[PDB]
Design a protein that fits this description.
The structure is cut from a larger assembly and holds twelve protein chains of nine kinds. In chain B, 60% of the residues lie in helices and 0% in strands. Chain B is an all-alpha fold. In chain B, helix 1 (9-16) crosses helix 3 (45-64) and helix 2 runs antiparallel to helix 3 (45-64). By secondary structure, chain E is mainly alpha-helical. The longest helix of chain E is centred in the C-terminal third of the chain and has 13 residues, at 29-41. In chain H, helix 5 (125-133) runs antiparallel to helix 6. The longest helix of chain H has 34 residues, at 200-233. Chain H starts with a helix and ends in a 5-residue tail after the last strand. The chains are: A mainly alpha, B mainly alpha, C mainly alpha, D alpha+beta, E mainly alpha, F mainly alpha, G mainly alpha, H mainly alpha, I mainly alpha. The interface between G and H is medium-sized, with 15 and 9 residues. Strand 1 (9-11) of chain F pairs antiparallel with strand 5 (236-238) of chain H, so a sheet runs across the interface. The structure holds heme C and protoporphyrin IX containing FE (4 copies). The site of heme C (HEC) has 21 residues of chain H, from helix 5. Chain B: One of its GO terms (molecular function) is oxidoreductase activity. Chain B: Component of the ubiquinol-cytochrome c oxidoreductase, a multisubunit transmembrane complex that is part of the mitochondrial electron transport chain which drives oxidative phosphorylation. Chain B: It is a peripheral membrane protein.
C-alpha cells in the first residue's frame, strides 16, 4: 500500500485521493487473488473505499 | 513566465540556502576547527559537498522553470 | 520416406523433427535455444560490422564513429552487437545456473557439462578481446591491466607478456592480432556448440521432476518449436528495448574517450559479466594467488559431474543452499564494480571462501547425507 | 623408422618455432626502443613526459629544497626501504618509469599528498623521489638505465 | 555417479587400486614431458 | 527405441474441439500465488542475504568515508 | 567413538525421519515413492537392480512415473481421495539394490569388477 | 576519496529524457550558436560535419552559408602546393589548433577535449555539463588553487583549467530569447547531448514500433503455442495403479 | 462456438498459393497502419519541438 | 573397447581408423586428402597473416610491405599463403579431372559431386576476393573488370553494381567489405568439406577397375595413412620449392605497383587458375552471352551425374575423348593469358564450342553407345 | 542411371508423367514468387 | 642511387637499418643517415622541426 501510494504521488506530481484509490485497488487485488469470485472485485472496492474515507 | 536577461540561478540558489542550514553549520564548524592548521592537508571539502548537494537538489527544478 | 533417401534429410529429421523430449519441460529449458540464437545474432552482426571497421590504432575509433553516423543501419548493427554480447552472457549464465540447480551435469551427462565449461571459457576470451577493438580508454586500460597478470608467473612472465603484446606495451600489433583472434574464435564457438548439442542427444534432457522420463516422450519439432518461439520473442522484446531506448545503459562512458597510454582513468572496471572474476582477483592481495583462485574456480566447475551429488526439488537441503550460492555470486558481481576498501576486501574474501565452500564441501557431503536420508 | 622419426621431430619443431616467433616484436618496434631526451629545455619545478619504449618517463628537474625534502624521508616510512641517492645518480634530474608495478597504471605528475605522483587507479600516492608511501602497490617505481653525456643529452634504454 | 560416490560406496579398495609398479611406469611419462619442453624451448647452457 | 512395458488407456481431443487461451485468465491469480508459495523460501533467503550484506557493506563504506574527514 | 556414534545415531534417525516426512509430503502429490527417485541411467547398480525384478513391479513403477510426468506437465496434483491413499515409503527396490551393492563391495575386495557396465546408447 | 571524486550533479528535468520525447530543435540551434562564438575558440568537435546539421538544426542554404564562412585547407593542386578554400557541406567543423601540442601550449599544458562525444563520455552527462558550466564557486576552507587553475567542485579534483566563459548577454540569439548564462549553458548542453546521440528521435520511433509489434507477436505466439499443446494438456490417462 | 465460415475457407485458405499473396497484402496494410499510429502519436506529443514545426512556423 | 564408451571416439574410430576402403586404390585417390591439407594450410597462414594486415586503402600496401620485411617469418607466411592458393587449385583441379575420368559422380554418389561443385564455386569466389586484398594494380583492375560485369542483366544492373561497390567505383568500402567476406568464406569451405566427406562415407569410394569392391575392403587408418603421407611429402617438396626458390613465378609483376584508378595497365589478366573462364568470357563478343556461357558451364557440371554415362577403362571411346577434353581445357587456360586477336578469338570460340559439345553431347550419347556395345 | 538413362530405357511413358492438374498446381507457384519479390522490393506503379 | 637518382626517385619502404650487415656496418650506416635531414615533431609548442 505505502509503496504504491507514494509511487503514484511522485508519478502524478501532485496530491489527491486518486493515488490512494490505486493503492487500495492494488492491495485488494493482491489480497483477493486466488479466492472464489465475488471477492476479487469486492476486496479492492473495500480497500479503495477505506482509502477514500481516510483521505 | 517572463525570461530575464540577468541570471536567475544565483538568486534561486540563495533562496534555497535556508533549507540547508544544518549542513552550513557543519561546514562552518569544520572551517573553524582547521583554522590553526600548519601541515596544509586539512580541508573541509566533504561538508562543503554536503551543503551544496542539498542546495543543488532544492534548486534544480526551480532553475529550469525560469529558462526557455 | 522422403527423408530416408537423403542423408542430410535423415540427420535433420532425427535431430530436429522427430527427436523425443520429456513432455513436462518448463520454461527453464529454453536457455539453450536462446544461447544458440544469440550466438547466431552475434556472428551476423559482427560479420556485418567487419565491413566498416579498421583494425589500426589511427583509424579504429574514427571508423567506429563513421559506422555510427554515416553507414546506413550502422548504429542499429553496432548497438545490436554491443548489447547482444550482454544478452548472450545473461542467457548463458542463466543456463549454467539451471544446470547447477538441477544437477544436470551428473551421469550420464558428464561430457555435456565439460563441453559447456569449455564453451564458457572460449566465450569469456572472445568477449574480452572484442572489447579492445573500439580502442577507447577502457578498451586500452583493461587490456593493459589484465594482460599484465602474466608477470605473476615467475621467470618467464615478462617474456610471455611481451610475446602477447608484440612489443614493450599495448599498441598497434596487439590490436591487429586481437582483431584476428576475435574474428576467429566465434567459429570455434559454433563448432563447440554443435558438439555440445550432439553430446546431449545421446541420452536426452532431464526433466523438472528429476526422474527417468523414457515413458513420456514427445516429438521435438511439433511441440518445442513453438515453445522456443515464445521465449525468443520475449528475448527480442528486451533486445529491442536495450538497442533503441537505453543503448549505453550496460556500457561505460570512458570507452567513448580515445585511448591515452599516458593518463589512466580513475576507476578501471570491466563489463558487468566479468565483474565476479574481477572481484575474486581483487579480494586476494597476491596476484599469483588470485590467478590460482580463478583457475581453481574453473577446476571446480570442471569437477562438478564427479564430485557433485544433489539435484532438483526433492533434494531439499542442497535446493536451499543453491539460493545462498546465487546470492554469493551476485554479491561478487556487485563487489567488482566498487573501489578497493577494507570492508570490501573483507567481504570479497568471505564471499570467495563461501563460493569455494559451496562448490567443494556442500555439493559432495550434503549430497551424500541427503542420499542417505532418502534411500539409506 | 627411427631414422625417419629423427627428421619428422626436427621438422615439426622447426614449423612450430616459425609459427610462434611471428607474434614476437617486429624490427621497427625493436628499433624504437632507444630515445634521446634533452635536459636543456627543462626548467626547475616542472615535469616533462617522454615516451621511452612506449612508456611515460617522469623526468623532473628538482630544486634544492625538493632534493632536501626527498632526502629527509627515512626508510622506516617506506614499504620498500631505499634511499634517494641509490635511486638517482643525479639528484637534480630524476629519471623514473611512470608505470605502477601493481597493475600497470600511469600516475599523474604534480599531484598527491606527498607532492609527487598520484596514481588514480587505486588512490595510491607516490613521493617526489619515486618511492611507495601509500596504496596497494608493493614495489617502488622503476628507475631505467641511463647515463649523462657531455651535451646534456640522456640516453634511455 | 563415478567420482566420489565410488569412494563413498566402498568400491575403491587396495585390491582395485593400480599397483606401485603401474604407478612407477605411468609416472615415468613426467620425464618425457620435461625433455620435450627442453627440446622445444632449448633454454639451456647444458651443451657447454 | 527403448521399449517400455506399460499398461494404460490414453485419450486425446482435437485442438479444434477445445478453447485455447480462455482458461488462462481464470487460472492466472492462482498460478501467481502457487508460484510464490513454492519458491517463497528460496527467494526470501536470497533477498535477505544479498540485501543485508550489501546494506552492511554500504553502511560501513559510508562510515569509512566519514572517518577520513577533518 | 563407538558410543560416540551410539548417541550420534538417534540424532541421525530423527533428522532422517523429519527429512523423509517433508520429502514424502512433496512426493505424495505426484503419486511417487522414494524408490522411484532412482534413475537407471544415473546409476548402474540401480539398472542392475531393476532387471532383477518381476515384470509387474516394473510395470507399476513405469505407470507411477508416467502419471507423475503427466501431472507435472499439467501443473496439477493428485485429487484428495487419491492423495490420502499415497504410500511414499513402501519400498519395492531397497532389498534388491542393497544386495547388488553388497555383491559389488564383495567383488571389489578381491580385485574383481562388477559384472555390468553403464547403459550405453548408440 | 571524496575530493578526487568531486561533487555529484543533480538531476535536471530535461525535456528529452523520456522515451516518448523528442529533442528541442530550437534549443539545438541556439546551442550551436553558443558553440561558434564561445566554445569553438578552443574546442574542435572533429566528428561533426555541416551536412549532418541539415534537417535537424538548419536548412540546406543556411548550413551552406555557415560552411562558406570557414577557411578549409585543401590540396594538393597541379603544382604540388597546399591552398585554402571555402568550406562546404561535406567539410568537418574547423579545429582551432593544428595538433594537440599547440592546444596544450595555448592553455597552460591542459588539452581541451573534443566535444562531439563529451555528453556520452561522462557519467551523468548533461547534468554534469550544465553544473560544471554554471558552477564556478568559492573554494572551501583549506583548499588552495595554483595560478592558471580555477575552482569548480563538479570537476573531479576541484581544479579545472577552463575559466568562466559564459556571461550574460554574450550571445545574441536570432529568435529573441534573452541570453543569460544559464540559458546559454542549457542550450549548449542540449546541443552537446544531440552531438553524442544524433539519432535519438529516430531510434525512439523505431523502438516504439518494435515494442508494439513484438508485444502483439508475443500474444499470437502464445496462442499458437497453446493450440499445439492442447491435446497433451487435456489428455486422460487411466491406469490400474492406485499406490 | 465461434467458427470460421466455409465459403471464406474455400477461397482464401484451402490453397497455399492463394493464402500467401493474401498474407503479403495483409502484411503490407498492417505495417502501414502501425506506421501511421506511431507517427501520429509521436507528432502529436512532441508538437512545437520538431524541425518541421519551426520551418512551417517561419513561412 | 575404449572407443565404445565415448561417442567422440566412436565416430573418430568409425570414420578414420576402421573405415573399409578398396585395397586397389592408386595414387590418383590422394587428391582429396591433399586438398584438405591445402585448405588447412591456407586457413592457418591466413589467420597468421591477418594479425599484420590492415584492410584500408593507404595502409594495405604498406602493411603488406611491413609484413614482408619486418615481421619475423612474415615473408615465409605471405609467400606460403600466396603460392598455397595455386597449389590448392592444382590439387582440386586434378581431383575434378579424376572424377571426370572415372565417372565418379554417378549413382549413388551424385550428392558427392554436387557438393564438390558447390565447394569449387566458393573456392573461386574466395580466391578472387582474397586476390583483391593486397591493393595493387592487378587487384584493383581485376576487381573493377569483374564486378562491372553485372551491367549485362537488363534493368537491374548498375543498381546491383553500385550496391556491391558501396559507391560509384571500386574504393575503400569495396576493399573493407572484401576483407570481411574473404575472412568468412573459408569456414564455409571447411563445413562444406566436412559435409562432402560425410556424403562419400555413405557408400564408399570407387576403384580403378570400376567394379563392385565390397568383397575386397581393408581398414583406412593403417593402410591409407602412410599412402597419404607419401603424397603429402611430395606436395610439401613442391610447396617448399615454390616458396623459397621461385616465390613470384606464378604471380604478376604489376601487382607490386600501388593501385591507381586513373592509370590502367597494358594487359589485365587474372591468376592462372581463373584463365579458362576468362578465355571463355573474352572469346564471345557479347557480355551477356559470355556470362550466360559461364553459367552454362557450371550448370552442365551440376547436371553431370544425371547425364554422364561412361567411366574409366573398359569404356574406351569416352576414355579416349577425355584426353581431347583435357587438351581443350588446357588450351583455354593458355589462351586467357594472350591478347585479343582474330585468330585467338576464333580458336577460343572453337574451344568453347568443343567444351560444351563434350560436356553435353559426348558424355550421354557416346556413353549410351558404349553401354549398348558392351552389354547390349 | 537416374536421368537420361531413365528415358533411354523407355521408363518415361505418357503415364508416370505429371498430369495437367499437377503441372498447374506446381505452375501456380510462379505467381507466389512474383508477388513475394514485388512485396520485398515495392516498385509501386513501375509498370511502364 | 645516392648520387644520381636520390634527387628524383623515392625509396619508401626502405630504411637505413635494413642496410646494416648487407653492404654497411652499423657505424657507417649511422654516419650515412646522420647526413640527412628529416621532419620531426611536433615539439612542446606544437611546431614541426628538422633533425639529423
Ligand atoms: C579558455 C579556453 C576555453 C574555452 C573558451 C572553453 N574551454 Fe572548456 N576546457 C578548456 C580546458 C583547458 C579544459 C580542460 C581542463 C582540465 O582538464 O583541467 C576544458 C574542459 C572542458 C570540458 C570537460 C571537463 C572535464 O571534466 O573533462 C567540457 C565539457 C568543456 N570544456 C566545455 C566547454 C564549453 C561548453 C565551452 C563554452 C562555454 C568551453 N568549454 C569553452 C578550455 C576552454
Ligand atoms: C564471427 C563473429 C564476430 C565478428 C566478425 C565480430 C566482430 C566484431 C568487430 C569488428 C567489433 C568492433 C566493432 C565495434 O566495436 O563495434 C566487435 C566488437 C565486439 N564484439 Fe564481436 N564479433 C563477432 C562475434 C562476437 C561474439 C560471439 C561475442 C561474444 C561475447 C562478441 C563480443 C564483442 C564485444 C563485447 C565487442 C565490443 C563492443 C563494444 O563495446 O563496442 N563478438 N566485434
Ligand atoms: C553457446 C553456449 C551454449 C549453447 C548454444 C547450449 C545449448 C544447449 C541446448 C540447446 C541444450 C538443450 C536444452 C536446454 O537445456 O536448454 C543444452 C543443454 C545443456 N547445457 Fe547448454 N548450451 C550452451 C552453453 C552451456 C554451458 C556454458 C553449460 C555449462 C557450464 C551448458 C550445460 C548444459 C547442460 C548440463 C545441459 C543439459 C541440461 C538438461 O538437459 O537438463 N551449456 N545446451
Ligand atoms: C577443398 C575441396 C575438396 C576436398 C577437401 C575434397 C575431399 C575429398 C576426399 C577426402 C575424398 C575421398 C578421397 C579421394 O577420393 O580423394 C573425395 C572424393 C571425391 N570428391 Fe572431393 N574434395 C574436394 C573437392 C571436390 C570437388 C571440387 C569435386 C567435384 C567437382 C569433388 C568430387 C569428389 C568425388 C566425385 C569424389 C568421389 C571419388 C570416388 O570415390 O571415385 N571433390 N573428396
Ligand atoms: C580463414 C582463412 C583465410 C584467411 C584469414 C586469409 C587471409 C588473407 C589475408 C589477410 C590476405 C591479405 C594479405 C596478403 O595478401 O598477403 C589474403 C590474401 C589472399 N588470400 Fe587468403 N586467407 C584465408 C584463406 C584463403 C583461401 C582458402 C584461399 C584460396 C582458395 C585464399 C586466397 C588468397 C589469395 C590468392 C590472396 C592474395 C595473396 C597475394 O597475392 O598476396 N585465402 N588472405
Amino acid at each position: 500500500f505505502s509503496f504504491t501510494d507514494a509511487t503514484v504521488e511522485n508519478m502524478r506530481g501532485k496530491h489527491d485521493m486518486t493515488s490512494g484509490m490505486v493503492a487500495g485497488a492494488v492491495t485488494g487485488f493482491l489480497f483477493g487473488m486466488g479466492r472464489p469470485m465475488p471477492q476479487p472485485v469486492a476486496w479492492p472496492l473495500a480497500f479503495a473505499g477505506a482509502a477514500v474515507a481516510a483521505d | 513566465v517572463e525570461y530575464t536577461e540577468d541570471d536567475p540561478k544565483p538568486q534561486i540558489e540563495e533562496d534555497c540556502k535556508p533549507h540547508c542550514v544544518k549542513e552550513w553549520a557543519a561546514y562552518k564548524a569544520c572551517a573553524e576547527r582547521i583554522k590553526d592548521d600548519t601541515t596544509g592537508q586539512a580541508h573541509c571539502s566533504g561538508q562543503y559537498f554536503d551543503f551544496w548537494k542539498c542546495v543543488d537538489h532544492c534548486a534544480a527544478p526551480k532553475i529550469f522553470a525560469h529558462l526557455k | 520416406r522422403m527423408h530416408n533417401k537423403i542423408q542430410l534429410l535423415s540427420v535433420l529429421n532425427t535431430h530436429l523433427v522427430a527427436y523425443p523430449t520429456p513432455m513436462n519441460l518448463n520454461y527453464s529449458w529454453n536457455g539453450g535455444s536462446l544461447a544458440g540464437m544469440m550466438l547466431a545474432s552475434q556472428m551476423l552482426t559482427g560479420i556485418l560490422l567487419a565491413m566498416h571497421y579498421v583494425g589500426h590504432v589511427d583509424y579504429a575509433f574514427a571508423s567506429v564513429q563513421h559506422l555510427m553516423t554515416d553507414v546506413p543501419s550502422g548504429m542499429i548493427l553496432r548497438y545490436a552487437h554491443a548489447n547482444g554480447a550482454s544478452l548472450f552472457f545473461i542467457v548463458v549464465y542463466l543456463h549454467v545456473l539451471r544446470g547447477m540447480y538441477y544437477g544436470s551435469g551428473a551421469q550420464p551427462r558428464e561430457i555435456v557439462w565439460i563441453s559447456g565449461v569449455v564453451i564458457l571459457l572460449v566465450m569469456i576470451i572472445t568477449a574480452f578481446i572484442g572489447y579492445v577493438l573500439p580502442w577507447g580508454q577502457m578498451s586500452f586500460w583493461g587490456a593493459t591491466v589484465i594482460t599484465s597478470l602474466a608477470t605473476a608467473i615467475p621467470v618467464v612472465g615478462k617474456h610471455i607478456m611481451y610475446w602477447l603484446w608484440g612489443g614493450f606495451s599495448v599498441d598497434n600489433p596487439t590490436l591487429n592480432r586481437f582483431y584476428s583472434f576475435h574474428y576467429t574464435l566465434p567459429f570455434i564457438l559454433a563448432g563447440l556448440s554443435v558438439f555440445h548439442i550432439a553430446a546431449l542427444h545421446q541420452y536426452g534432457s532431464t526433466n523438472p521432476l528429476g526422474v527417468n522420463s523414457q515413458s513420456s516422450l514427445i516429438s521435438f519439432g511439433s511441440y518445442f518449436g513453438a515453445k522456443d518461439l515464445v521465449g525468443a520473442l520475449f528475448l527480442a522484446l528486451v533486445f529491442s528495448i536495450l538497442v533503441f531506448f537505453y543503448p549505453d545503459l550496460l556500457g561505460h562512458p570512458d570507452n567513448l574517450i580515445p585511448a591515452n597510454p599516458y593518463s589512466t582513468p580513475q576507476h578501471i572496471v570491466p563489463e558487468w559479466y566479468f565483474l565476479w572474476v574481477y572481484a575474486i582477483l581483487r579480494s586476494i592481495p597476491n596476484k599469483a594467488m588470485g590467478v590460482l583462485a580463478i583457475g581453481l574456480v574453473f577446476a571446480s566447475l570442471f569437477a562438478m559431474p564427479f564430485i557433485g551429488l544433489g539435484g532438483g526439488k526433492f533434494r531439499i537441503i542442497t535446493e536451499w543452499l543453491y539460493w545462498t550460492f546465487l546470492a554469493d555470486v551476485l554479491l561478487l558481481t556487485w563487489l567488482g564494480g566498487n573501489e578497493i576498501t577494507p570492508i570490501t576486501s573483507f567481504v570479497g574474501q568471505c564471499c570467495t571462501a563461501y563460493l569455494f565452500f559451496y562448490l567443494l564441501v556442500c555439493q559432495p557431503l550434503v549430497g551424500y547425507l541427503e542420499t542417505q536420508f532418502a534411500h539409506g | 623408422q627411427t631414422g625417419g622419426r629423427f627428421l619428422y621431430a626436427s621438422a615439426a619443431r622447426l614449423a612450430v618455432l616459425k609459427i610462434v616467433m611471428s607474434l614476437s616484436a617486429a624490427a621497427d618496434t625493436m628499433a624504437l626502443s632507444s630515445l634521446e631526451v634533452d635536459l636543456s629545455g627543462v626548467e626547475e619545478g616542472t615535469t616533462i613526459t617522454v615516451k621511452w619504449r612506449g612508456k611515460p618517463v617522469f623526468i623532473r628537474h628538482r630544486t634544492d629544497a625538493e632534493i632536501a625534502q626527498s632526502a629527509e624521508v627515512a626508510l622506516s616510512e617506506l614499504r620498500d626501504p631505499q634511499k634517494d641517492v641509490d635511486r638517482a645518480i643525479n639528484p637534480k634530474y630524476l629519471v623514473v618509469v611512470g608505470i605502477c608495478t601493481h597493475l600497470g597504471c600511469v600516475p599523474i605528475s604534480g599531484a598527491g599528498n606527498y607532492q609527487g605522483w598520484f596514481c588514480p587507479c587505486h588512490g595510491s600516492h607516490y613521493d617526489i623521489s619515486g618511492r611507495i608511501r601509500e596504496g596497494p602497490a608493493p614495489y617502488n617505481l622503476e628507475v631505467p638505465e641511463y647515463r649523462f653525456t657531455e651535451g646534456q643529452k640522456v640516453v634511455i634504454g | 555417479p563415478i567420482g566420489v560416490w565410488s569412494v563413498f560406496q566402498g568400491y575403491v579398495t587396495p585390491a582395485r587400486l593400480p599397483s606401485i609398479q603401474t604407478l612407477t611406469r605411468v609416472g615415468a611419462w613426467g620425464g618425457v614431458v620435461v625433455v620435450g619442453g627442453l627440446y622445444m624451448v632449448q633454454p639451456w647452457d647444458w651443451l657447454a | 527405441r527403448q521399449n517400455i512395458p506399460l499398461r494404460e488407456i490414453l485419450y486425446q481431443l482435437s485442438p479444434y474441439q477445445q478453447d485455447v487461451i480462455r482458461q488462462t485468465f481464470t487460472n492466472a491469480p492462482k498460478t501467481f500465488l502457487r508460484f510464490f508459495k513454492e519458491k517463497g523460501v528460496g527467494l526470501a533467503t536470497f533477498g535477505v542475504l544479498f540485501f543485508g550484506i550489501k546494506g552492511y557493506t554500504e553502511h560501513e563504506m559510508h562510515q569509512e568515508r566519514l572517518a577520513e574527514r577533518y | 567413538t563407538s558410543l560416540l556414534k551410539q548417541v550420534a545415531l538417534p540424532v541421525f534417525n530423527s533428522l532422517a525421519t523429519t527429512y523423509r516426512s517433508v520429502v514424502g509430503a512433496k512426493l505424495a502429490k505426484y503419486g511417487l515413492r522414494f524408490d522411484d527417485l532412482q534413475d537407471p541411467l544415473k546409476d548402474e547398480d540401480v539398472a542392475e537392480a531393476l532387471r532383477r525384478l518381476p515384470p509387474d513391479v516394473v510395470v507399476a513403477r513405469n505407470c507411477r512415473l508416467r502419471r507423475a510426468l503427466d501431472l507435472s506437465c499439467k501443473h496439477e496434483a493428485l485429487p484428495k481421495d487419491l492423495l490420502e491413499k499415497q504410500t511414499p515409503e513402501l519400498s519395492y527396490l531397497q532389498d534388491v539394490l542393497n544386495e547388488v551393492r553388497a555383491e559389488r563391495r564383495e567383488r571389489a575386495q578381491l580385485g574383481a569388477p562388477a559384472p555390468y557396465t553403464r547403459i550405453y546408447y548408440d | 576519496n571524496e575530493a578526487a571524486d568531486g561533487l555529484h550533479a543533480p538531476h535536471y528535468p530535461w525535456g528529452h529524457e523520456g522515451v516518448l520525447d523528442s529533442y528541442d530543435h530550437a534549443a539545438i540551434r541556439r546551442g550551436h550558436k553558443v558553440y561558434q562564438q564561445v566554445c569553438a575558440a578552443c574546442h574542435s568537435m572533429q566528428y561533426l560535419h555541416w551536412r549532418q546539421l541539415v534537417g535537424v538544426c538548419y536548412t540546406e542554404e543556411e548550413a551552406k552559408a555557415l560552411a562558406a564562412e570557414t577557411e578549409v585547407e585543401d590540396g594538393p593542386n597541379d603544382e604540388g602546393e597546399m591552398f585554402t578554400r571555402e568550406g562546404r557541406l561535406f567539410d568537418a567543423f574547423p579545429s582551432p589548433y593544428a595538433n594537440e601540442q599547440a592546444a596544450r601550449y595555448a592553455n597552460g599544458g591542459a588539452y581541451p577535449p573534443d566535444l562531439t562525444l563529451i555528453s556520452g563520455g561522462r557519467h551523468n552527462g548533461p547534468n554534469y555539463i550544465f553544473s560544471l558550466l554554471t558552477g564556478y564557486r568559492d573554494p572551501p576552507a583549506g583548499i588552495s588553487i595554483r595560478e592558471g587553475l580555477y575552482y569548480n567542485p563538479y570537476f573531479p579534483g576541484g581544479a579545472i583549467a577552463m575559466p568562466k566563459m559564459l556571461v550574460d548577454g554574450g550571445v545574441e540569439y536570432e529568435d529573441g530569447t534573452p541570453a543569460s548564462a544559464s540559458q546559454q549553458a542549457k542550450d549548449i548542453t542540449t546541443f552537446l547531448a544531440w552531438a553524442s546521440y544524433p539519432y535519438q528521435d529516430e531510434m525512439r520511433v523505431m523502438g516504439i514500433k518494435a515494442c508494439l509489434m513484438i508485444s502483439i507477436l508475443i500474444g499470437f505466439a502464445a496462442y499458437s503455442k497453446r493450440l499445439r499443446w492442447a491435446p497433451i494438456k487435456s489428455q486422460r490417462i487411466v491406469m490400474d495403479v492406485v499406490n | 462456438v465461434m467458427r470460421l465460415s466455409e465459403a471464406l475457407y474455400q477461397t482464401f485458405f484451402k490453397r497455399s498459393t492463394v493464402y500467401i499473396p493474401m498474407l503479403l497484402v495483409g502484411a503490407y496494410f498492417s505495417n502501414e497502419a502501425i506506421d501511421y499510429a506511431v507517427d501520429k502519436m509521436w507528432t502529436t506529443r512532441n508538437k512545437g519541438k520538431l524541425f518541421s514545426d519551426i520551418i512551417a512556423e517561419r513561412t
